[PDB]
Amino acid sequence: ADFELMGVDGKTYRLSDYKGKKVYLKFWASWCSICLASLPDTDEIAKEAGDDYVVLTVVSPGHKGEQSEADFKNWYKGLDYKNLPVLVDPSGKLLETYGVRSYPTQAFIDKEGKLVKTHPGFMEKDAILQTLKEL
Ligand SMILES: [Mg+2]
Ligand SMILES: [Mg+2]
Ligand SMILES: [Mg+2]
Ligand SMILES: [Mg+2]
Ligand SMILES: [Mg+2]
Ligand SMILES: [Mg+2]
Ligand SMILES: [Mg+2]
Ligand SMILES: [Mg+2]
Ligand SMILES: [Mg+2]
Show the domains of the chain with their CATH numbers. 1-135 (3.40.30.10)
Ligand 8 centre to CA of 72 (Å) is 9
Distance (angstroms) between ligand 1 centre and the Cα of 97 equals 23
Asked if residue 57 lies in contact with residue 86, where contact means CB atoms within 8 angstroms, the answer is yes
| Amino acid of residue 75 | W
Helix or strand holding residue 115 (H, E): strand 115-120
Q: How many CB atoms are located within 10 Å of the residue 76 CB?
A: 16
Residue 96's SS3 state is helix
Q: What share of the chain is helix, strand, coil (3-state, %, to 5)?
A: 30, 25, 45
Give 33 Cα–ligand 4 centroid separation in angstroms. Answer: 5
SS3 80: coil
Q: Is 134 exposed, middle or buried (0-12, 13-18, 19+ CB in 10 A)?
A: exposed
Parallel/antiparallel/unpaired status of strands 86-88 and 105-109: unpaired
Q: Tell me the CA distances in angstroms from 121 to 9, 28, 47, 104, one per residue in order.
A: 26, 10, 22, 5
The technique by which this structure was obtained is: X-ray
Q: Hey, what amino acid is at 42?
A: T
Q: Select from 111, 117, 103 the least CA-distant residue to 23.
A: 111
Q: Is the alpha carbon torsion for 108, 110, 114, 116 positive or negative? A: negative
> Which ligand does the CA of 88 lie closest to?
5
Number of the ligand closest to the Cα of 78: 9
Please report the resolution in angstroms: 1.5
Distant-in-sequence, close-in-space partners of 22: CB < 8 Å, separation ≥ 6: 52, 53, 54, 108, 109, 110, 111, 132, 135
d(CA 59, CA 87): 6
Looking at all shown ligands, the one closest to residue 32's CA atom is 3
